[PDB]
C-alpha cells in the first residue's frame, strides 16, 4: 500500500495533494457538541491566471493564462487549525500554522514575469 520517501523522491508526487476515490461521495457528521480541527489542509495549484492591465479602461481586463517557471514548488501543505462549529451550525476554519505560502513566479505571453506569494496565511 504505502509510499516511502524513496518511492516519492524526485517524481513530482511530493508537490501533489492526496486524492480520494470516485467512490468517496459520503457525508461526515458534525456533532455540534464536539470540538474539531483540520489536521492537514493541502492546496495544489494547477493554474495561475493574471489579470492583464489594459490602456483601454474601456472594457474589462481578463485573467490570462501564464507559464509556471519555478517548477514543482507551488503547493501549500501540512496546514492545520481549529474547525469551529458556530451557533448557526456553520463551520469556521481558523488557520493556525503550516507550510502556508510559496513564492511562485509565472510568466505571461511575451516574457513579463509575475512573482507572487501564493498563500492562505491567517
Amino acid at each position: 500500500q504505502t509510499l516511502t520517501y524513496d518511492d516519492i523522491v524526485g517524481t513530482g508526487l511530493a508537490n501533489k495533494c492526496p486524492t480520494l476515490d470516485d467512490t468517496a461521495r459520503g457525508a461526515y457528521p458534525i456533532d455540534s457538541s464536539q470540538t474539531y480541527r483540520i489536521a492537514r489542509l493541502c492546496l495544489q495549484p494547477t493554474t495561475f491566471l493574471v489579470k492583464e492591465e489594459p490602456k483601454n479602461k474601456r472594457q474589462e481586463a481578463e485573467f490570462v493564462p501564464t507559464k509556471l517557471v519555478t517548477r514543482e514548488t507551488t503547493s501549500l501543505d501540512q496546514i492545520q487549525g481549529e474547525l469551529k462549529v458556530n451557533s448557526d451550525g456553520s463551520l469556521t476554519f481558523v488557520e493556525e500554522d503550516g507550510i502556508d505560502f510559496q513564492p511562485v513566479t509565472v510568466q505571461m505571453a511575451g516574457g513579463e514575469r509575475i512573482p507572487l506569494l501564493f498563500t492562505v496565511k491567517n
Partner: protein, 56 residues
Amino acid sequence: GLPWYRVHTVLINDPGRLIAAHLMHTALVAGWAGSMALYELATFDPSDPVLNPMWR
C-alpha cells in the same frame, strides 16, 4: 584597367563565378530578412493590436 563602374563585368563569361556572385547576393538578401525580423522582434510591442498594431 577596368573603370570602377565595370568591375563586375569580369563575370560575363564565367558562369561558375556568376553563380557564386548570385549566391552571395542571395545570402546577403536572406541575411537582411533574418536581421530585419530580429530587429523588429526586439522592438515590437505585442500588447495592443487595437491601438498599437504593427503598422503604427
